[model samples]
Target: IPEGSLQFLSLRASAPIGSAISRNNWAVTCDSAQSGNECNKAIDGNKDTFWHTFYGANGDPKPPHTYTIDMKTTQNVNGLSMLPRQDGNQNGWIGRHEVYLSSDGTNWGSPVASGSWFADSTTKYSNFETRPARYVRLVAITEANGQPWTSIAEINVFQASSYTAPQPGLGRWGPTIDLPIVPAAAAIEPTSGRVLMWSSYRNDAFGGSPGGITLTSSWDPSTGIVSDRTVTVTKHDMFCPGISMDGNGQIVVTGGNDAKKTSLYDSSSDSWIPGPDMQVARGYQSSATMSDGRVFTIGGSWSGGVFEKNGEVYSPSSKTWTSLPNAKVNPMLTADKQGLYRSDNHAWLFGWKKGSVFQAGPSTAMNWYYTSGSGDVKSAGKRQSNRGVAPDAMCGNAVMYDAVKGKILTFGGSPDYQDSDATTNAHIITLGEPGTSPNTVFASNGLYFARTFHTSVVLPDGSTFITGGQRRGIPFEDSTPVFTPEIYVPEQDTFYKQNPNSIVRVYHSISLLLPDGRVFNGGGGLCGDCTTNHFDAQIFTPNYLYNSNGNLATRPKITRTSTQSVKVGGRITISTDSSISKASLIRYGTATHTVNTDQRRIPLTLTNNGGNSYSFQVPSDSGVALPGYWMLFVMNSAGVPSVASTIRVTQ
Candidate 1:
């Protein structure tokens, strides 16, 4: 065995077969077909003829239009090349599209590749992982010119040769670097592309208890450098505070040491603005940026006192904090033995339509909070029951993986807030329409490890990157660190384990998706002189960015965006260097104590407008995509993502 001389290769590096599959043996079926322009005409080997959705006497069918092709036998398929209408008219040209593969033609799970194809008469390529399949389905989501029609001149498929690679499915970790502070709380600066983070009272260590002074710093990922700053004028200890990024990308942090204190970080100016103190002082509470751009927070008995905390809202325009009389914590409290102090801490909140907020977990029971006019709380439902009771999952992590679809994935936490064993439980919560009870289903396969105090980041490809937690639900002690990280593939409904990091990241540890498609995992145990204190952080490169040979894989590049800001449902043109197979937007993240309400991944629907330019639609629902800064990432045919372009989603 010549192991030393073995060469590892990239999956896409192999040359695809040049010959297109013979369409003589192909059978095509479409949802709607005109009499003269039948679906079979798409593969007639004559580019002069074309297939068109019904538009003659009857009106055209509304998209998404579909065309299923049967190869007659299983074949190794890697990509498809399509030719739009060539009748000298651009009418009915395909725009936003998706491709799927199936063995039986019945169970087409998920689209392997999806993106906008150029609207011109030029041929378009849609590449995906090479696989053996007999049936291929192509879906036309929208027309090139926003029409309701679809037209195709020709369809062709090709296969690629397989090559050997080492550790093909695992991600890589970069070298760790020391930080000035533990970074107990952090947010990404929109305009600067830097990270603004802070620890409790000191830079590298925290006082035994919460204090007035706060140590903060900004880290530039492009240069791997840091600049230190301290906040004293606000007289706020932001450790364990409720944090959220508003529509303007401003950091609004509330409650923690000096309970009731509100401190706002204006990232545009790199300065702090003092906010009026909250009516109800809280500590360990969770906050969410509402669809209307207001910030809402509730339930934090970790400081202030051990009592039921009420909900409150902060209006950026008025610069005032108003107490919500009807929003109570009793409906969503977990069954923790430590009572309100632990049961009501670190709530899980997601902003929804209008000025509403959805509370999914920490507690088994769920609730919806209405923030318009007088606030009101209503029971949504409970997660699955355990034995006879609905079990709690305090200290776990959750992320909205699909905002357009209103899907959330939450997993891994202890029954009680602390001093309890962790569970490898996971659930998918789906929201439909406003004021509706969310549907919850258990994941087919949960996490590999039973963990608590873990962190989960939603990547651009709609998969979740889970990392850094403990087997037990203890805080500040390095007793049982789960160093190995895992990735949740949504298409397969499973998790894949990745390479491990030696350092421990639990309790206050954080993991955020960077604009470069990598993850920033750092911090834990900010306690002063505590043995578990980790004054450093590491960068994780996902499997998508690495070749089998452990080298950086070539990726797609985003040349420019039409605008830096867009209103909901507005379309923007994005220029790219390479053909993109997918595109998505991840909200800029801010986290503390395994609770990050600021982040969510929204898959964008793109329309190809020719010349490598894609028109992307901002989500129409403000609740799905809260107004704030977002990172736009485009993926190549090989699934490799480009460095994100920062964009703002506004009202």
Candidate 2:
């Protein structure tokens, strides 16, 4: 080769090391301290400072100590880089070390990567091919002269893009869906393009003063429209009330502290009208839309007192409540208020393959029920009782069903009824056949936050968006606020963090999936924290809604649907402006007590009968999709979702 000829040099491929939650607090503690507060200096990436392990002053302690990077979720990597301090001759800079990773704080896997320290302040690298780990540990196996002394100036991780953690959305915001009722209980209404928000009396005011009233506003994504007008209401139960969708696509709101009579908000009339009273008045009553479209309301103590054994069902046809026979014991509201720990898990109806209403605890055994509509409620076991090891274990925790994957994800919440037991360990359950309950297993991943009263909403991309709520656990206020939110990806059984939210929404927050594929959130703090409360609002647009350039991406346009109502295993024609592509049916969310059992996303099979018209198959099984109104969206090959078109699911 001629020396004048161009020569190419290949570079070793490596994904750049970036920031994670571990990079936030920079927390560190060693087996023994060298002297001053330098344990955190090593992770700070400062050449002037270092984290040293001396065993004891003047080498009084010993060698073979261990250091930990502590924690991270959704980060997968096969390599690491460690640098020694430039302060010394590089002796006692640690000669040998082992690297390991773990998801739970407890058990960890074998050394996936190992390192050999270098002097002259040069960086040492450790690379291997293994699954991602949530926590990393560095064990000093040998010391200079066996004295067991060491100092590290910088320790950064290296990961592949495939293993790079996900940020739920590109850091972007949309202000369209903001309103005055900052923090009110909210749910989507079909015919009206409305978002219903109401809560027990706040210091604020609506059409009237902020009473325990219902406020309705229509939101139409097609033409940049929001809710039409506002209406308010209530015999309010300020703690935990019921707001679910009836089979007729109406918002069925039952007993509350000030809520005197049962009323259903008719989108057709755009007003809250009279329905019927429950046989038993309950303060924390839980309700789920039955497969045949009846409203089933169960157990609650009067104002949080003695538990009630009676439950009842509301007839959409009769506008009446009939007592449910206990031959097949109905689920009691005796569990954690947010026991299942899902924003919409407060009173969940898991309509996936198993298709049963769940009675779960923050950490207790789970139960399920299915009504024959013959007045017989069947106590059926879909998933086994011992399915998830940790038992979710905290009321203020949040859970959401990943409809497309037939999976369930639970995270946050206190470990017990106590506020001090808050946990952030998130887990996933891949739902199994009704009879094969044990098949429902937790995805072996770790959670990063522990919160109570937080909310989780399913986004259009089949990933769930979680937001708002408090830390510091249950049965308390003024708990630390978890400003950043999470995105649950069921396909990969992982969770990712998004941009930080400015509000602390500790006691009450409403996170909902909008028709436009954006998320609207607000509520929390009772007239405090610089007014981040029931009247404040925030909207988050997901990454899928944006182009590579970071602006709003070209979204698919939803023109219309064949019928307003659909039955299980049937077909519905969806007409759109663009060529027919992917399709999905998402239920309008039902929420209260920070739980929304009404939210679930069902992907559909788009049949190209060949034209602008596409046929979609509604979930064939009632268990997979209990009855109610759903918002259907068409998608392009690029994965862009169309503005949602509302459809009702009936018997």
Candidate 3:
């Protein structure tokens, strides 16, 4: 029998007269009885019988028999009917039986009807109305001569008129695709109306046995579509390739096996060139280009169990990476800074961090933070943990967008270090303030198989694209893991497969945004019998556009009040457009606060007694915090907050 065969159970039997329950093809019970007799004794033959009985009363033409038949396996079972079997003597009459049906294995319903008895064998059939049922049972209501027994010869059932098997849709898998290497991350890049991608590939020889890295690219927007362009970045081991675009539209790759190295690719040149290296070596990290033209590098592994505690900002003008003073405590980080307005310098970081082995006791898994910065890095108070969020056991990634109701969405990755049926799963986490619980918006059975070291990116339309990563104990085969990528549209909150013919899964793949609004997904290793080799890249073209409403492009500039120091209980007023919806003030060292909207001016009373010089905040669960230093954030009726602007507060 197959491992999952237990899920299919069609027949079960029981002999009430003998106190026996027969399963599959065997019977076991305390009732000692003869066949065809109702009550006190009977021999059951069919495994589909639920119960059978035989009983004798005053020696009246022997005894009657009663039996029940299982109907769960009945095909096209639209309705059921029964008629008495003519056995000559009136004492041997067949009792009227009631028919019951059920959909789920559990939960039973009342009988649809009781069959009418007929004396003639040839004309004894009765018909019932059509009913949708997966399981059905028959019960003998009464027997002739009150013999306390009943018997049944056969049972019949019918199915509904328009019954059909379910079919897979947009986020479902259909078939598998073969690739040479295992991919890390994948993104849909659209070019001239075609979808392409770039991925990071690891060598086949490096499977289970680590130590090798190669970046590859591929293109396929339709089924049976494949591209052959492969670019090898290096022969050394590299992991977690963070790919993005600079202001000039050149592709920027950062943080591989060696975090200290950064690379840039100019499509015109078709060559990779070294860019500014990070201040520290951190692999398995995430990077994002800010609206202010600064590239921010978040958390990842520095070495051996040790994770990087700090983040860095890259300045394109000087081509230098400046270490941010404030660092995210998370081990894995995913950030989005594009929707952020210049008036609001805050960027949302969603990921998980290990419980501190030291202070504050063991922490819950997977947390989110809103980090604020200006010319330099500074830490603002962290938001509260989301309740019921999955553990961030290994290789987990998260994505965020302002359009997602100010909530950061996370998916996929492992829940534990070891690969088990439960460890390799997918989940979503939303970010909120302390004391406010985060919601687990989604979860998957890991059905396609366990995906560790995978990537999840938000498309321009607010949907998410997830691809690549290796499953535990599964060898990298000639046919790489099914490459059909899954997409999650925010409106549906469900995952659907993209065009499998156009996408492939490879570990360590990178998805970068191109100038024309498409994404470039490339790199990653292909699978071998026991290992995988690196492959070239590919591109993914987004079917939608970013900021399609042009709301951000036409928003009014945010003006601020003079910056000054204020006492904990002091009140502050921020002036902005009368069309503004709400406002917030986030003190540099305190949790953000919501400001009340009265008339045109927003008012907030401070309560931080710690005497923090700077503070920031946003209106009501906005999730956007005012950047630390001298800045304020105000939201217009459009719901888009202005960028951080220098301001002064008076005590």
Candidate 4:
């Protein structure tokens, strides 16, 4: 039995309970005494080290004092157990040791389980298992006969389960083509996948007020053919026209100088309707489709060098005009405000501002759910300007098709008309990912002559077709400026001159990519009659199969001393692949080490050969260096690097 078992309950008793001395002092004469008080005052010189007390009222029955220990924070505990200790041999009694549980630490309710006296034994242990709980508490409901209190040794907690959280998807831009033609404005027809691009040319009638001429063409990507259509509206005075497709497959053209009106053309009906006139007579503005299926027209220039502040929304259902506060400003002499796009519940306006592309946030009224306010849209129109945004001089338009990536590609565009640098620094500007600062993904010099007022359109295959613009050094008054077209592949980061047959184009030419993948170029100035302005159109069959493989002649290369070497570390110097260019070496299985021009040989330190006849490690820390493989990569070169050669190291 345990040392404190009831069998020796009164081992330290000094005198009988009914004796006179014992009766006067019942605690001192009891069967159990306080610890360390083994000898009485007379025997041990009255030194007191241990202290004990009894709680019974004179001759009256005493109830146990209840104390409980609880957890501060809630937990999902499946079960619980406790160990307690008692010291005295007094006729103490312990009853109903109970354990309570709670989901929340506060307001604990019932017990998960309870245990009885645990068969009174000396310094005994008791345990009770219960159902899982978030929180737990233990209570000493009853105590011993003399003190009615219990002491605890230790407590533990446990659980039977766990949990996890969910994650979100990665949003990015898919592969996209950069259309060869520059587009001032674009409209998409959902059902037919027909995209219409209009040239930003003022009509020659109103002192050359930009308008659409007899140059109207349609493309059908499905058939890979672009058909020249003789639509009556094509001949109408159309400038800065906003085109949108109605649910019924009809195309709606609104707000142009020649017509100074809004008209709807039913492709099925082949007819036009004068819907509604604009609040302000403006040209070179932009249009975007709202989530509510309404069309929004933003910034443009009015008569007499007057530009309009504030935008207007046209409701297709009601055919009404609602004014919005001017949230944008148009820079003089530049055609930046061409088109607006709806993204993430906000209207994004993209255009040039002082030789750079800028992005502006929409006002509250432009939001989808028109909650309060007069619905008269207004904006403080804050702008997040990307200073490095490239200008597409040939076309005032920048292509933004990858809605998910929020990347806009800009090509061509003159830097300064009066400066010599105008033709020197022409390159493509690729806007950074949404929420990131816009930067150039790639760049080229003098790819095209200083040409403004060109058209660039995106194709279904994610390539861009750049066509026709007024070349600098040619007199602006010169009729029919001879300009050429080109194709740019974003994937290859290269530009190829298109077939010369596709060269004829004037400023403000319209190119549309039909659902069939054919490109139609129309309504641009022609030089046949020697007069600068002619409404002529042509169709170009894109050599989609044409692969202008990139030229790597300008790239650098690396050559090692030997293909096979001993496993022992050795110095190997690398030299430029060609003297005309610079070279860098990329090693594998180690940090990158630059090869000095004077000494190319670097140390080859191989750790594990695995008994293989040939094992090698290249420079690392830079370029493309990885384990299990090694190669030399040269960058900043106009040419491609040599094919990777296998190297062997033997011990």
Candidate 5:
């Protein structure tokens, strides 16, 4: 009596019904199995075989036994039937039982059905208001023998007619661009529509490439391609260089083994150029593009002992850097204040809004800077009561969100090297001034599994797609890659799980959002399964791009835009062929950690010029939208956004 099945769960009943999907992938364990019977025998396609529990022959665990099935993807479960051994031993049959279902394997819902079955009930049939779930569990209470011995011949789960095997919004949009080198750091050039990827110095001659990590490449999203580019030819190691974009649409690449080695990429010229060195050397650092068009380099390794105490910023106009005061702590605090700790103190940072920043999370705190009205921080600004995300400090992780949403999110990272507790929890914070209440809070239901050092990006549709991370937290060890990518629905506050990828990615595994809205996650780490290094790249198409019958989804098209360059607090118009319902200026997104400053969104109002065109107003405030290039997208009522047309904003 759990009400009628959901409208989406309508049944067909005629399509050749299959058994529990991929029964081989199904795993089962019970209190115990009868001496000669095991769980495998139940689905071995042998009716002569049976899975007997360890209760009858004075078996270990008495009745009231249980086992669970992990379907992995949601399935329209129409029918569940149990088969017993034909010539059977009476004890080899299920008696009284209950069934439960859940999208996630852990939380089981109210019983779908329950009743008693006799041994002679050769095939026990139970039908009800069908439901959809990724997991189904059966609990057996009291065996046919009333002696605790319970066994099953086979279990069949019927799929509903409308059920298109469980799927997600993310799909392989195009071909994979196997890179020449694994991209340790990457950023998307909105103006030229190229992905700039690099690795420090090559440790080995990987993929027949030379040493010293001098590898770099440009990925063209239009054709699902990557073009090899000449390395800037660096003497220092870009082991993990800091990356962010400047106002002129140039990527300001900083940090690495030698922080002083600076590099810049001008999308217009499609060339690399040498940049002024920083006053100090910083390794393992981070960078952020600030409100006033300056790129700030956060704390990193000083090349001597360890973590650097202060940070610095680069003025796009003057082409100079001035150091700022140190971040809050010499030693960062863990969420639980326990033994776990992070050494690269506060290396994780975000340009929260127009003026301030969020320093860290599980107990994540924030600090504001008082720029000298002209240059870098004059003093260590105020540290707000700003709370971080939960379960404890995620040492290395990532965040994805829009400024208008009032808060950003923190997800998938490790607490320490020996992380017994990495989390997939998406913690949120509503922006607020310091000295008052906390801005950070945890969501009700978190991610499906534990993840760390992964990558996530926002699509034009407003949902975030997360890919490439370690399933379990293990430093330098990605044994089980979290390949099943997920799309996070901020409204529902839940993650939509999809069919997993076979080419599992690791720590630096990153991606970029294309002008066309398809996410390009290509050659990052190349390997099969658990091999530490890999470079095979493949594309995944989002469910929004496809129809129910697996065809293309009709999407709005951005035919033209009023201008590419508009001043801060400027006004412009957009031209689109499709009828428009919503329009917004979304700064393009990047794949690597903290490399993207595309933190904000400004809603655009539309006035249609009949069916052929529509005009809209651009955000007039730089604070609302910093001076930079942004992707202008017009979405239909379905939220099927067209390939974004690029537009630049200036002062």
Candidate 6:
């Protein structure tokens, strides 16, 4: 018997497992079936008799045949197992399919599980995180054997244990809170501690594949208040857009659904302005704010068109986009099976000296992009493993743990864009000066779990928090969820495992650091009524916050600041009550599709000024301290950092 009120039913001859559901109480109300085969044969418990779609002289329906089953009572269903026709004829076997659930018989949401199945006669299984529903529907989109008809011999529905697994050892996880939008793209608003996030056209489901409005929401951490807004004025769908915070601290979003369109979000006024269009239409591109206050974006071909979408720069003062003709995509393309389509998407960019950008890659070979005038690209050597072998880390991510020292940690990803196993490889790249290749060293201590589609955020304490992703790189499918979070400690050069959470944050998920010293982890699937759509978020408190006794550690306090605005190479006074051991600035970050070009930690060298004052100098090089708003954090001897104070940095 199942853990719920569902009961098992015996088919004509085969008995189904679990008590959560029964075939006797099941009734098929709707089906697109052929005349003689009939739909009842699917639940008849007989392997010999099967249900086949219309394949008559008039010709079988092309594909996408669907069936709705009423379970009589609502049950907590997690998965379903199906048996193909036992007969030797392998003509109408189902291949790619989707399973959806609905509370009422009329309103079925997005498919809970959607993927391709093996073409064998053996019983096949489609599973997902459990959901409550009274009705279940299955849609077969293609025939495994290339036949038009879809056939099913026997079907069984079972209720498995819930997906909630909690282990509070390394850190604590808060309960998941409902969110208005999926948070496919998210950023920390400057000055204000509000999280500005957006998804596709719909709130729970994904829409606007090509172009449409976007659903946006803001969450105020101070009051825990959330507000929803539908952005239709700009007529821009910001999915897969290149995002970066400009010199004025406004979010510059470029080229996605409404390819070539640009939108700027001014947090000061809490409004959106339609900015100038880009010369090149792109999607899934990476962008970074330059030392000279301009924004540079490059290599996005996942949308708009499948070709080499080159580099371009956006000037906030002029409100215009200038194309960089010499900054070609060929120099930094990954060796993906999809050629330029996937290879040219998601370049890892970092702002450097003299408006130059470093492309430390998803591709093995890196490049240096000079953004002055027409711009130019130069090869910066290949990223090698400990064995000195170059490997592609497509769909992987990187974080600048220490910008002052020019240190970036790159980790995780598969060889291809999708349908591949992830790698547990990690590397640290230490930057030298501009116009020269950076030094890359493979980290002997890799991640605890191999991951792709994962999100990595640099914490205030100088450690990196890694979360979400799957072992297999399949988008929209939650088959191999990695629940346990890991933290990369640079000082110790080790990856520590944290407590596991209940949620499965995979492909479309996002993670970013909050002002109050917590990590916001949320979003995965955006498919409507798709059982995987998670319209919610969870907060994680890292181990640094607690002591050995599990009590909150005492944190240092930043009582006062000499000035809120400072220029590169300038000195500032910080008044603190507790003695601080370290002080650093982390630029406000925004993330989508595993890439975050904004966040980077810049450590400040401190000197004792007087009684309660300590002085520090910002990085002299503008490239080391990219012009933007930064989260200034002070840590004590105990390594507990105080809540960040927002500071503005100028070139």
Write the number of the candidate with greater lDDT, choosing between 3 and 5: 5
The TM-score obtained by model 4 is 0.41
What digit string (tens of lDDT, one per residue) describes model 4 on residues 558-619?
44444433232332334444531222222111000000000011223333222222223444
Deviating ranges (above 4 Å) for candidate 6: 1-169, 202-211, 302-307
- Per-residue CA lDDT of model 5 for 499-611, tens digit only, reads 56544566556777777777766433322122344333445668777766777889877777677788865667666665778877777654454234453465676676776
Per-candidate TM-score against the hidden true structure: 0.72, 0.64, 0.41, 0.41, 0.66, 0.75
lDDT of 2 by residue, 1-651 (tens): 110101111011111222223466434567766666367877775777778766444555555777776554646654566666666455456655666777764676555533233223434444443346666777776653455476778777655545423243444443323332334566776776655665443331212234454444443445433332244454443435676786667888877654335767767667777678777665555677766677776554443444333556778888787776551333323244443222222444443333245544443344555444433333333322233455444444434455555566666665444445566656555555543333344443545565777777876667777776666754325447776677777767777777664335566567788777788665554331122333334567777787877667787776766788878888898667777457778888866556676787777877876668788788777766667778887888887888787788876
Weakest ten-residue segment in model 2 by summed lDDT: 2-11
lDDT: worst 10-residue window of model 4: 590-599
In angstroms, the error of model 2 at 622 is: 3.1
- Among these predictions, the greatest TM-score belongs to 6
Off by over 4 Å in 4: 1-237, 245-250, 258-260, 304-307, 330-394, 415-446, 473-484, 526-536, 546-651
Rank the models by TM-score, top first.
6, 1, 5, 2, 3, 4
lDDT of 6 by residue, 143-190 (tens): 876678888988778774543443445887763444545678899997
The predictions' CA RMSDs to the true structure, in order, are 22.1, 20.1, 24.2, 35.9, 17.8, 13.6
Give the per-residue lDDT digits (tens) of candidate 3, residues 234-336.
4333444455443333445666566578776545544456788778666544455443334565554445544444666776678898776454444223221
Model 1 root-mean-square deviation: 22.1
Identify the superior model by TM-score, candidate 2 or candidate 4: 2
Positional deviation of 577 in candidate 2, in angstroms? 5.2
At residue 549, give the lDDT of candidate 5: 73
- Cα deviation at 236, candidate 5, in Å, is 3.6
Shift in Å, residue 501, candidate 4: 2.7
